């Protein structure tokens, strides 16, 4: 079955790359949006479904399609976004933090903090949900 629901309260978000400062690892700047300048390179895709830890502890799907991971060899962060296969647009789109972690209690079924708000993920493969897991702790490994 779906993991158990749990209780996300928020804390504080800072990202390095959204920072503007001279290489990731540092706090302090005041940089505005922005103007010209994104390059960020694709690793994986797979679909999966973007559910969110409803009252009464019970998953409630946003919207799924296709999703990938996304890494920024330049900006030096990795962003992960899905996109609709009806809409092919943005469904749900997540800006990972320092220190990012991917838990995985299930087989296929990831989660992590969203905004203000749980959020889960579940691949609709399992394998493309190992590979993932797999992936990501590849790159944390590979760090640097």
Same mark, same amino acid.
């Given at each position: 079955d779906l993991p158990p629901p749990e209780p996300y309260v928020q804390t504080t978000k800072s990202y390095p790359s959204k920072l503007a400062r001279n290489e990731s690892r540092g706090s302090g700047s005041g940089s505005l949006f922005s103007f010209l300048g994104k390059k960020c390179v694709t690793m994986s895709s797979a679909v999966?479904? *973007? /559910?969110?830890?409803?009252? @009464? &502890?019970?998953?409630? +799907?946003? &919207?799924?399609?296709?999703? &990938?991971?996304? +890494?920024? @060899?330049?900006?030096?962060? /990795? #962003?992960?976004?899905? $996109?609709?296969? +009806?809409?092919? +647009? *943005?469904?749900?789109?997540?800006?990972? /933090?320092? @220190? #990012?972690?991917? @838990?995985?209690?299930?087989?296929? #079924?990831?989660? $992590?903090?969203?905004?203000? &708000?749980?959020?889960? *993920?579940? #691949?609709?493969?399992?394998?493309?949900?190992?590979?993932?897991?797999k992936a990501v702790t590849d790159l944390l490994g590979r760090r640097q």
């Open positions: 999966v479904q *973007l /559910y969110a830890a409803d009252r @009464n &502890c019970m998953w409630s +799907k946003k &919207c799924s399609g296709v999703a &990938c991971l996304v +890494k920024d @060899n330049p900006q030096r962060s /990795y #962003f992960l976004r899905i $996109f609709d296969i +009806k809409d092919g +647009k *943005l469904l749900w789109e997540q800006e990972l /933090y320092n @220190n #990012f972690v991917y @838990n995985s209690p299930r087989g296929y #079924f990831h989660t $992590f903090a969203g905004d203000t &708000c749980q959020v889960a *993920l579940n #691949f609709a493969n399992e394998e493309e949900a190992k590979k993932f897991r």
